[PDB]
Copies of this chain bind each other. A is one copy, B any other.
Amino acid sequence: DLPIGKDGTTLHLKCKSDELADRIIFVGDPGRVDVISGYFDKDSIRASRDHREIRFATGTYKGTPVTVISTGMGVDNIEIVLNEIHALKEYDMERGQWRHRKGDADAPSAGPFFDPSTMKIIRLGTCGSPAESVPPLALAVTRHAIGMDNTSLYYSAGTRETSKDQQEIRRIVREQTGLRAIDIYTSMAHPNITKSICAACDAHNAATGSEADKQQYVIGTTATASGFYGCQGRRVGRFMKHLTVPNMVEELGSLKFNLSNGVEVVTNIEMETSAICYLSDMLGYQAGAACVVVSKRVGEKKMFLGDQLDAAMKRCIKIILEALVSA
């Protein structure tokens, strides 16, 4: 059920309990781990290991412990890494038992108790945007999420009650897009994470009088896919006539969600966020996501890679580290 090495490491993420911080940045690309850890406090990296697509490094930022982990691509990879983080934080290997939480029936009244709210997890990724308004290389910050994948369906996502706002998102997506064919699920980033990210963006821009060092951002719904091409409505060769949702981008882009705190739109599409939000919330860990827009699927109809991306990612790394330690 949960393979643990003789060295106390989990199976994919080769990290031991005492090497993992409560505050974690997820990146998809293993290459981004070294870029991020370079921003950690000088000589603070105390643990690091690489295996498959899964790399980590743990240091400090402004004195607060932080771990950066590459997950590789997809919600399936997320499911792996979050299960292993769960075991590293809450399975006491020394005693061979799961840690108590407040409210456990047969726990001693003294505990000790593990507080899941101490876990803060933020994805810093890349993404596409179906929104005409959203600029190239903007930071798209997740509030709600649409799971077009099915990973969380194995964790009762199809039956567990959701908020009124999430019910409205699901209704609109099911009625007004080709996802009518899919048992989609929803989730939401923890409000504390979304707020922290936005505040960090604001602080960044306020701290520079150079227009070139500004970072644009947007907040909205992130749609997460179980692939990159047809799974995101890309039309490729001999596959295109077989697509279930060939007009995914335009369909998602047309949506407006009339939600409790105002109107929300689908700001971005990527491959991890839905499961990060859902599985983290299920565990009581605070999670969210922010992704640099590298593909404009409308308007510009371009990709934005290379130097421009590198510069945007440098700004966003600092913003996310700031948000993470202030959460």
Contact = CB atoms under 8 A, between A and B. Distances in A.
B83 A239 contact: yes
A159 B181 CA distance: 10
* Interface residues on chain A, size class: 35 or more
Given A153-B244, A237-B91, A77 B74 contact: yes
A234 B83 CA distance: 10
A239 B73 contact: no
Interface string A81-104: 001001100110000001001000
A151 B231 contact: yes
Interface in A29-53: 29-31, 52-53
Given A2-B237, A80-B228, A156-B244, 19 more contacts: A1-B235, A2-B236, A52-B53, A73-B74, A74-B76, A76-B227, A79-B229, A79-B231, A83-B236, A83-B239, A86-B237, A90-B237, A91-B237, A154-B230, A154-B243, A154-B245, A155-B230, A160-B242, A238-B283
Interface of A: 1-3, 11-12, 28-31, 52-53, 72-77, 79-80, 83, 86-87, 90-91, 98, 101, 149-151, 153-156, 158-160, 181-183, 225-231, 234-239, 242-245, 271, 279, 282-284, 303
